[PDB]
Design a protein around this ligand. Sequence first.
Ligand SMILES: CCC(=O)Nc1ccc(OC)c(Nc2ncc(Cl)c(-c3c[nH]c4ccccc34)n2)c1
Ligand code: NA
Length: 306
Amino acid sequence: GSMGEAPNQALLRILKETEFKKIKVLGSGAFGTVYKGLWIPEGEKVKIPVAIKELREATSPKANKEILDEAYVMASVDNPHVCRLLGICLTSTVQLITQLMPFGCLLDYVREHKDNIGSQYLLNWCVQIAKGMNYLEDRRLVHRDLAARNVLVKTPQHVKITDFGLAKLLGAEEKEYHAEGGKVPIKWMALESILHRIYTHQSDVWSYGVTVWELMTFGSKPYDGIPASEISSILEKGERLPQPPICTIDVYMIMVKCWMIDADSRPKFRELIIEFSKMARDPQRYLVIQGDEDDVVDADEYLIPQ
Ligand SMILES: CCC(=O)Nc1ccc(OC)c(Nc2ncc(Cl)c(-c3c[nH]c4ccccc34)n2)c1
Ligand code: NA
């Protein structure tokens, strides 16, 4: 309890609204709306595809608060497996501008390409998502909303984590974030998060296991048919998501470890990177898929806290 805080010198970039045009709606609902768009900086021979996020809440001040908190976090992160803020645009309700991810979210992707998705892809996605989370952990960020819908696809070989609407920054030696009231997706949440509103890097790991389960089932809904109010008592009873058909015990065991009652018994993201990348060297030994396609680890898969 002696470490202080370093200054955050991230630049917040404010973009002119005239420099980009909307093209079509990509998605919308309660959260707000996301548009596909093209950004054309003033004195340059460049056109950049972007997503334009317009969050919607009860009032404009409410939306603007939430959206500026999200811009803070996204402006502070820079990793190949995490979405990056290009900047914000100061309309009546603020717009978040980010890179367009042309293949959409990973959840819809695995649903739409179920039949042409092999073991190599699935396992590398798991590696890449873990690399993203591990980086976020090194930035002392708890994501709190990791799910297949919140993983975006730049290319089938390259995915990035998105949606920092619920993300929280921990203090220097701080371990937990205690949430107030507020909707959070119960079916991706760790038990302690549901019971006590405690969120940690290890509660993010629980969400990761559920995200991997989504991928391995080719985009099934977790605990399908079950109402959210019944979930915590199910988990308290020791019940968990079932073993996906394509999964070997080796892979299913990793998921179960992510869903341990004891948060500190769950794997660390750095360990998941190692485990999944080892598996990715021999994909068909670990996933058994219809119509598919040394202990040595590369230093880029051996990540040490920063
Ligand atoms: C799971 C649903 C899904 O993401 N669809 C989807 C389809 C097609 C796309 O590209 C042509 C994309 N590209 C994309 N690029 C950047 C962002 Cl920041 C978002 C994005 C963030 N939040 C969202 C909520 C709803 C829709 C999109 C987003 N999307 C996304
Ligand atoms: Na392994």
